[PDB]
């Protein structure tokens, strides 16, 4: 059902769409987006769960 | 195409209220050529300059 619901479809557009949740009005630029996913859980420095 | 891409990502913008975003979005449009674009435009401001100079000389009050 989920993924019905969700139009998007590639890495590339979810990506987009996960910044444009987080900085709605910030013009995706391709790099932009996914280093703000990968910098969101797998940046070693900004997450530890120890 | 540069003025295209400014609307598209207007019409997504979500009253994020933030100025940083929306002066990064313009400035993000204008491109910068170098090297001899610059000195182009330089070359604008001489002659510009001279014109007025030539009136100066050529003009009866303003030598006055």
């Known amino acids: 059902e989920t993924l019905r619901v969700d139009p998007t479809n590639d890495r590339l557009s979810a990506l987009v769409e996960i910044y444009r949740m987080m900085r709605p009005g910030e013009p995706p630029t391709r790099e932009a987006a996914e280093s703000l996913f990968e910098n969101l859980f797998f940046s070693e420095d900004r997450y530890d769960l120890s | ?64």
């Not at chain 2, 330089?42 to 009050?61: F, L, M």
């Open chain 2, 1 to 64: 195409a540069a003025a295209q891409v400014l609307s598209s990502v207007e019409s997504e913008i979500g009253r994020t209220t933030d100025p940083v975003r929306m002066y990064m979005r313009e400035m993000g449009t204008v491109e910068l050529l170098t090297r001899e674009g610059e000195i182009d435009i330089a070359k604008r401001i001489e002659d510009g300059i001279n014109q007025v100079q030539c009136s100066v000389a050529e003009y009866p009050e303003a030598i006055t």
